[PDB]
């Protein structure tokens, strides 16, 4: 138990978690565009001129 000074280390291992990327890199999934306003069907001339 003299606890002498040992030599300098050769290198460094570093352990850390890696993320999973099987999900991302996929084609994007955007929010679907709301439709442009379309005229309602069944619009008729309700007003007829008097006389």
């Amino acid at each position: 138990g003299g606890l002498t000074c040992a030599s300098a280390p050769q290198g460094t291992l570093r352990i850390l978690e890696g993320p999973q990327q099987s999900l991302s890199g996929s084609p994007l999934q955007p929010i679907p565009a709301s439709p442009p306003p379309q005229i309602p069907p069944g619009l008729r001339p309700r007003f007829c001129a008097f006389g």
Binding site: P19, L23, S24, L28, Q29, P30, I31
Partner: protein, 63 residues
């Protein structure tokens, strides 16, 4: 070389609510441009009183 990976992992954890990361966390990575840009660093904010708004993360498909 690891900091965009950590920033994307934290956004992934945030939007999927996985590792008790709050959904109101700001994961800011100011990149090292080598030019007089903003001071770089990975800044993480979870404190109150910040303004925050919903967008949709297109990679995850969630808000």
């Amino acid at each position: 070389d690891l900091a965009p990976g950590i920033a994307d992992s934290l956004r992934h954890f945030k939007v999927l609510r996985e590792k008790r990361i709050p959904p109101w966390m700001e994961v800011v990575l100011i990149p090292m441009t080598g030019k007089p840009s903003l001071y770089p660093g990975l800044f993480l904010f979870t404190t109150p009183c910040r303004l925050v708004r919903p967008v949709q993360n297109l990679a995850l498909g969630k808000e």
